[PDB]
Amino acid sequence: GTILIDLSPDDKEFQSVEEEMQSTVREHRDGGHAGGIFNRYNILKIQKVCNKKLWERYTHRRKEVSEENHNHANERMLFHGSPFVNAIIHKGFDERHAYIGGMFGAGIYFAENSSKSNQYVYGIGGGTGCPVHKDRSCYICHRQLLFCRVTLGKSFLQFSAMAHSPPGHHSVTGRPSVNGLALAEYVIYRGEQAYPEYLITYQIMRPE
Numbered sequence: 001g002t003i004l005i006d007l008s009p010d011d012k013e014f015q016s017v018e019e020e021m022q023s024t025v026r027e028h029r030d031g032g033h034a035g036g037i038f039n040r041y042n043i044l045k046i047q048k049v050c051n052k053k054l055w056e057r058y059t060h061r062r063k064e065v066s067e068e069n070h071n072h073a074n075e076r077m078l079f080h081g082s083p084f085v086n087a088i089i090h091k092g093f094d095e096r097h098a099y100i101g102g103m104f105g106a107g108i109y110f111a112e113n114s115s116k117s118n119q120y121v122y123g124i125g126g127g128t129g130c131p132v133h134k135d136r137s138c139y140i141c142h143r144q145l146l147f148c149r150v151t152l153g154k155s156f157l158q159f160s161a162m163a164h165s166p167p168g169h170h171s172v173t174g175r176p177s178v179n180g181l182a183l184a185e186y187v188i189y190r191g192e193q194a195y196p197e198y199l200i201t202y203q204i205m206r207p208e
């Protein structure tokens with residue numbers, strides 16, 4: 001029961017999402033192997049995701065987390081990257097399929113850095129690249145990220161050297177302990193704690 005509302009480039013809501021999309025690009029330590037080499041995106045379209053059942057699922061779980069955390073859901077707007085955003089905008093997030101392990105264990109991954117989410121669009125470590133050119137840095141094929149509303153509540157703070165929640169926590173925060181430039185990543189283990197608000201269709205742009 002999902003509806004997609006295409007946003008005009010003139011809409012204030014379109015510009016504030018693209019802005020967040022463009023300004024959260026950062027240099028990547030891996031030399032762009034996973035997500036490709038680029039400094040900015042070409043936004044082809046942004047779509048608002050509306051689904052009543054999914055929203056109720058989210059707000060319901062949000063109320064429970066909030067009451068377990070001094071009335072603080074600790075809600076963020078985070079980017080999500082994976083090759084399943086097509087099923088997700090219809091079926092919503094589902095922790096049952098989130099068994100693939102990452103840097104911070106298994107679970108559903110989000111990031112403040114859009115370019116970090118871009119790394120996982122075509123699979124873990126970029127997979128084998130786009131289905132058509134097998135190029136992880138393809139400048140032609142379309143990519144899709146979700147700009148989601150996520151509930152973090154009491155989040156366990158994990159530091160890196162750069163599946164259920166920890167007892168008494170509703171999520172996990174992944175933070176670099178030396179590179180203060182890389183923004184945080186987040187992992188949740190309840191599909192109900194994330195709602196995909198926006199669908200961003202884009203291409204990475206080849207630097208000049």
Ligand SMILES: COc1ccc(-n2c(SCCCN3C(=O)c4cccc5cccc(c45)C3=O)nnc2-c2ccncc2)cc1
Nearest residue numbers: 082084087091092093094097098100102107108109123124
């Ligand atoms: C294929 O390579 C990947 C790429 C991204 C993920 N992933 C995922 S997959 C997307 C979330 C889980 N999930 C699904 O994986 C999923 C797959 C197929 C159909 C679905 C229908 C509804 C809901 C889902 C799904 C769903 O919720 N979440 N975090 C990661 C991740 C990101 C970065 N590092 C580690 C894990 C897992 C595997």
Ligand SMILES: [Zn+2]
Nearest residue numbers: 130133138141
């Ligand atoms: Zn391609």
